[PDB]
A paper describes a structure:
The archaellum (or the archaeal flagellum) is a specialized organelle that enables cell motility in archaea, serving as the functional equivalent of its bacterial counterpart. Archaellins correspond to the basic building blocks of the archaellum filament, where they are organized into a helical array. Like archaellins in other species, the Hbt. salinarum archaellin is tadpole-shaped, consisting of a 45 residue-long N-terminal α-helix and a C-terminal globular domain organized into an eight-stranded anti-parallel β-sandwich. The globular domains of the archaellins face outwards and constitute the hydrophilic surface of the filament, which is mostly negatively charged, while the α-helices, which are largely hydrophobic, bundle to form the filament core.
The structure of the Hbt. salinarum archaellum filament was determined from archaella isolated from 4 M NaCl-containing medium and diluted into 1 M NaCl-containing buffer. The twist and helical rise were refined to values very close to the initial values, yielding a map at an average resolution of 3.4 Å. Symmetry-free refinement improved the overall resolution map to 3.2 Å, and revealed differences in density among archaellin subunits. Moreover, those regions unique to each archaellin face the solution and hence do not participate in inter-molecular interactions, preventing the prediction of their arrangement based on surface complementarity. Consequently, we built a model into the central region of the cryo-EM map comprising 26 archaellin subunits that share a consensus sequence, in which identical residues among the five archaellins were explicitly modeled, and with variable positions usually being modeled as alanine residues (“Methods”). The conserved N80 and N93 residues (following the numbering of ArlB1, hereafter) presented an extra density that forms dead-end protrusions extending from the filament surface. Indeed, we could fit three sugars of the N-linked tetrasaccharide (the composition of which was previously defined using NMR and MS)26,27 known to decorate Hbt. salinarum archaellins at the N80 glycosylation site and two to three sugars at the N93 site (depending on the subunit), with no density being observed for the fourth sugar at either position, probably due to the flexibility of the glycan moiety, which projects beyond the protein surface of the filament. However, the density extending from N93 protrudes from the protein surface, with no interactions between the attached tetrasaccharide and amino acids of adjacent archaellins being seen. In summary, given their distances and how they point away from inter-archaellin surfaces, the N-linked glycans decorating archaellins that comprise the Hbt. salinarum archaellum do not seem to play a significant role in promoting or supporting interactions between archaellins within an archaellum filament.
Numbering used by the authors:
A (entry chain Q): 13 to 193
B (entry chain R): 50 to 115, 118 to 193
C (entry chain P), D (entry chain I), E (entry chain H), G (entry chain K), H (entry chain M), I (entry chain C): 13 to 49
F (entry chain T): 146 to 193
J (entry chain P): 98 to 117, 120 to 145
């Protein structure tokens, strides 16, 4: 009589113990994938970053109309897709955020275009050697940049790494085809 | 509990920047560009609240939909489909809060403390320090 | 029958710790290679 | 159960290091523009 | 998990030092051409 | 384990997310969130 | 009558676990306030 | 009864962290005076 | 319970960093006064 | 790559072998073995 009661309850103990084991392991399984992902993206936030070689600009009449930045893959970074990066423009006039546009040259408006300089891809920095030129149109994001102005460009990659550049038009553009912003 | 406890820690909002528009001589808007933190699931900005600790006021802004903002905040998207929910790592939204409406028009040097509170409780903090010289600036960088 | 329950749960703890231990080591290994480069 | 606690703290530790890494780089980026100017 | 954090921050220090080194060399290069002329 | 992505759904594009729970006969479940690399520019094979 | 004994011990086990859960969080509550300060 | 086991283990890492906390601060204490002098 | 161990170490880590800041400032303070004279 | 900003154009030159060069540059070896890679401190490449 007493043994019969022990048998049925013993099954209950085994089933309950298996239930508790399931809760622990599956929860640990969820956290492992969440934890593993965070380490990769957070390291991606710090490592994948854009370095700006130099920023020159074509000169029309007597005011800069283009702001071309030569950007390169930073030190120890993975692929940097520029077509998914945003550029913030805080200048003497407007205060917008420029997103990528598939070809425009002169019709960039409130966007930016990336023409390749060195490499295979024309929007994806792969190796250290590859350099990409970012095309931004001055007299369409605001107005043609005047003599001795300033622009606050923060090229932000998709992973959050910000590269701040301060373009400064030369104080005088007397008979210059292009300057070094 | 395991999912939400991880959610409380994981889904966080990182503030890319904060630029305010300048009218006459006062930062009348305060725009915040937010992004998903490292390894964060879908963050909904509609069910989020912002605490405004400023010089003259101290309230907690909530969400709204479309100049006529007052004691709320509105989110206009910048990159990536939806205009209230962060889905991928590459999406950005702008948080609009009419500064002269939630209190008085922000003057030079006046600092504002913000705490964007996600739905699951994760908090981010920002100290927007208005430049102490607004003379002849179309838009500043708080 | 209290002893039976402990034995099964004990196996879960060792597995859970191994899962948590593995996550840290591989994550550091990724950061080690990333940092060295 | 101890393995569970390690993972949640591990996520926070990575996030804080990312936050600290942000301040160092952004401030350096700001000074670089000011310094070259 | 303190080892996890120090890896990420270590990367930040290296990048910041390269940023500061970049400003120094570039400014010296500018003045050298200005000085030589 | 061989699995045809272009037959269970579609050819996994960039940034795609697939969640797998390999469950043995007895019931034990192993979860693995496969993460397609963010950009597939010039990669013959990748590490999901 | 084995089931009857099973139930009473089960009641105590839930109460005992509640004590340990209480101590852990309340102690963590103190260090949280101390750590923030 | 698993709560009782947690309590003893709970007490352990309060002391262990305090032991780890103490050595870290004191080793900074020696470096404090040496650097200033 | 791993959180409890983390919190105590966090307090020590903050205090140690404060000490290092103190010596780095005060020694810079003395050198300024010696430099000015 | 070498950046040219003259009185007229402001382009970015890249290496195109065998020339005498449109918008490219060539590297002859003044002193050394390799004519495109500076290996030691003594090599001079034009
Ligand atoms: C920033 O980076 C962008 C990257 O695109 C760069 O863009 C270029 O800017 C040029 C200019 O400075 O505005 C543009 O120039 C024009 O187009 C050229 C080409 O067709 O792309 C050239 O075109 C020929 O010009 C002759 C000439 O007699 O005027 C004309 O017959 C005719 O327009 C074209 O004839 S063609 O060559 O047979 O096709 C010419 O520029 S040039 O080559 O420098 O002489 C311009 O008309 C260029 O298109 C544009 O992509 C910005 O300059 C940077 O600031
Ligand atoms: C680097 O980062 C850039 C950022 O822009 C990224 O660029 C995009 O890549 C997308 C994709 O290749 O990943 C391109 O997506 C396009 O739209 C897709 C979808 O409609 O959203 C796909 O569209 C196909 O269009 C065909 C066509 O006959 O019309 C249709 O059959 C159908 O709508 C789609 O079929 S599909 O191709 O078999 O899926 C398609 O991309 S795909 O699904 O990956 O194949 C694209 O047309 C997007 O245009 C592009 O800017 C780069 O990919 C990154 O490397
Ligand atoms: C050396 O230093 C001199 C300092 O004078 C500098 O050249 C001068 O710069 C002035 C200015 O740009 O700082 C030029 O001012 C001109 O007049 C302005 C104003 O009217 O007083 C502006 O005039 C524009 O004219 C247009 C036109 O269509 O008539 C009108 O739309 C409107 O009146 C003005 O529009 S605007 O250009 O968008 O402002 C204009 O200067 S501005 O306001 O800065 O734009 C100039 O025409 C002055 O002519 C110029 O010589 C040199 O450049 C330095 O090298
Ligand atoms: C913070 O972030 C918020 C995000 O919304 C941003 O808000 C915008 O700021 C603009 C400006 O103040 O910078 C506002 O611009 C005005 O409204 C626009 C639109 O109606 O929303 C435009 O409106 C037309 O402007 C013409 C023009 O001749 O002035 C007028 O006839 C009339 O006001 C409007 O006519 S319409 O187009 O036929 O409707 C115009 O801006 S524009 O589109 O950039 O040219 C402005 O009048 C904008 O409304 C506002 O949401 C803040 O600026 C950031 O600080
Ligand atoms: C982030 O959080 C936001 C929070 O708003 C969420 O966005 C949306 O929130 C809406 C709401 O505020 O909850 C949801 O609205 C949906 O549509 C409403 C309306 O039609 O516009 C409501 O629709 C019901 O539909 C039934 C149905 O039988 O058709 C009708 O009886 C009637 O139209 C509505 O009845 S109701 O549900 O009893 O009200 C309803 O919302 S409600 O009125 O608040 O109840 C919703 O179906 C919307 O779905 C939601 O997306 C974002 O999605 C989050 O990411």
């Amino acid at each position: 009589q007493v043994g019969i009661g022990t048998l049925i309850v013993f099954i209950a103990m085994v089933l309950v113990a298996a239930i508790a084991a399931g809760v622990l392991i599956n929860t640990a399984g969820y956290l492992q994938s969440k934890g593993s992902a965070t380490g990769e993206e957070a390291s991606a936030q710090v490592s994948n970053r854009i370095n700006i070689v130099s920023a020159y600009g074509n000169v029309x009449x007597x005011x800069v109309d283009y702001v071309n930045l030569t950007v390169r893959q930073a030190a120890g970074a993975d692929n940097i897709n520029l077509x998914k990066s945003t550029i913030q423009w805080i200048g003497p006039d407007x205060a917008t955020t420029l997103t990528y546009x598939x070809x425009x040259x002169x019709x960039x408006x409130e966007n930016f275009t990336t023409x390749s300089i060195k490499g295979x891809x024309x929007x994806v920095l792969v190796d250290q050697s590859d350099r990409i030129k970012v095309i931004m149109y001055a007299x369409x994001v605001x107005x043609x940049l005047x003599x001795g102005x300033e622009v606050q460009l923060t090229v932000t990659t998709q992973y959050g790494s910000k590269t701040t550049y301060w373009a400064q038009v030369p104080e005088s553009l007397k008979d210059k085809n292009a300057v070094x912003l």
